[PDB]
Amino acid sequence: YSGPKLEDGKVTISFMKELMQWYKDQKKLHRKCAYQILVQVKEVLSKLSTLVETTLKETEKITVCGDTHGQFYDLLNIFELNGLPSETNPYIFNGDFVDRGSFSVEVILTLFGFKLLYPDHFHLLRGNHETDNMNQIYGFEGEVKAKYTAQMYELFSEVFEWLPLAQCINGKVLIMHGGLFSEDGVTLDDIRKIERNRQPPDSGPMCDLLWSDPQPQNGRSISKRGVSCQFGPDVTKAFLEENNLDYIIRSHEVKAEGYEVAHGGRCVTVFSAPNYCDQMGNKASYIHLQGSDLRPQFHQFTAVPHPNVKPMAYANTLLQLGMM
């Protein structure tokens, strides 16, 4: 009731514009309204398939963004550079909305708000940082406990469990946060059937979708992250052949340029958090795909000013007082 207010218990574009300005000005969304957004978006997400399947007509486009990591001011910049989301300007945010960045609450509630507003044109896919083990140390849990209470965090966690794991555009481009699989023979049929409402297992398809990285050399390698695998071009090739796909778009890896094209064009990385952690000095990018041409078109962007709040401000003391 203090700050932005839902209209008859629903998100509206006026609410969303009010919310973005409220957040821009470093104000807090009332707990009752945050709660409502969370319960309503949980219901929406929990009805979706683990694999979202989207059809883009010849005249339509969609924007694909990678990690945002609580960089809310850079999120708003994406919308200034590329237009707000709507039925004619659809978006996919490819995981890792929270952690590291000190405005994670603002990014996620804005993202859930636009999911409730344009549920068929605003897509959210889970990342590895939409999980408990990462949130407990990399800032999101601490931020939510600081801005709300421990119990709100437990609700965010449960909502994240219902985020779909991948999205397929026109049966030709498959989008997931992390990547492909530690074993051969995984299909789109398998992905659709993943029981995703949980924390990811230590290994297996759900873990890979959120954790794997591409490597340049053929075959697989132990992951640099201690979970899932690195997968080479022949792994990517095999998977696309068996699933009649053209290529994959994934995120999960910081790139100095905000993107990378790997595996002879078959594995595209997109990363949407510029000057990551206020220190990487990287550019970010977003991609456009069109129904008449599903080749990715890259759009690079640089960081913009934000309030004087250091990254990892709500994180593990070990990470918090260890950079800047």
d(CA 258, CA 251): 10
| Shortest distance (Å) from residue 254 CB to Mn ion | 7
Cβ proximity to Mn ion: between 84 and 254 the closer is: 254
Identify how many contiguous H helices and E strands the chain contains and give both numbers.
11, 14
Residue 252 in the binding site for Mn ion (CB under 5 A): yes
Cβ proximity to Mn ion: between 106 and 118 the closer is: 106
- Name which position in 23, 52, 64, 67 contacts Mn ion (CB under 5 A): 67
Rounded to 10 deg, the angle between the 72-82 and 13-24 helix axes is 130
- Name which position in 104, 128, 157, 275 contacts Mn ion (CB under 5 A): 128
- Site size for Mn ion (CB under 5 A): 5
Give catalytic status of residue 306 as yes or no.
no
Cβ proximity to Mn ion: between 60 and 260 the closer is: 260
Phi-psi region of 33 (alpha: psi -120 to 50; beta: other; left: phi over 0): alpha
Q: Which residues contact 47 (CB under 8 A, 6 or more apart)?
A: none
Does 96 count as an annotated binding residue?
yes
Among 304, 284, 287, 303, CA closest to 295? 287
Residue 213 in the binding site for Mn ion (CB under 5 A): no
| Shortest distance (Å) from residue 248 CB to Mn ion | 15
Residue 130 in the binding site for Mn ion (CB under 5 A): no
Residue 297 backbone dihedrals phi, psi, to 5 degrees: -115, 120
Cβ proximity to Mn ion: between 123 and 252 the closer is: 252
300 sits in which H/E element: strand 297-301
Q: Which residues pair with 250 in a beta bridge?
A: 269
205 sits in which H/E element: helix 205-211
Q: Which two tokens stand for residue 232?
A: 């080479």
Does 129 count as an annotated binding residue?
yes
59: Cα within 13 Å, side-chain hemisphere:
1
Residue 74 in the binding site for Mn ion (CB under 5 A): no
Does 275 count as an annotated binding residue?
no
DSSP-derived secondary structure letter, 201: P
Q: Given 30, 121, 123, 129, which residue is catalytic? A: 129
Does 196 count as an annotated binding residue?
no
- Name which position in 96, 106, 130, 213 contacts Mn ion (CB under 5 A): 96
Would you name the residues annotated as active-site residues? 129
- Interacting residues with Mn ion (CB under 5 A): 67, 96, 127-128, 252
Extract the annotated binding site for Mn(2+).
67, 69, 96, 128, 177, 252
Extract the annotated binding site for substrate.
69, 100, 128-129, 225, 252
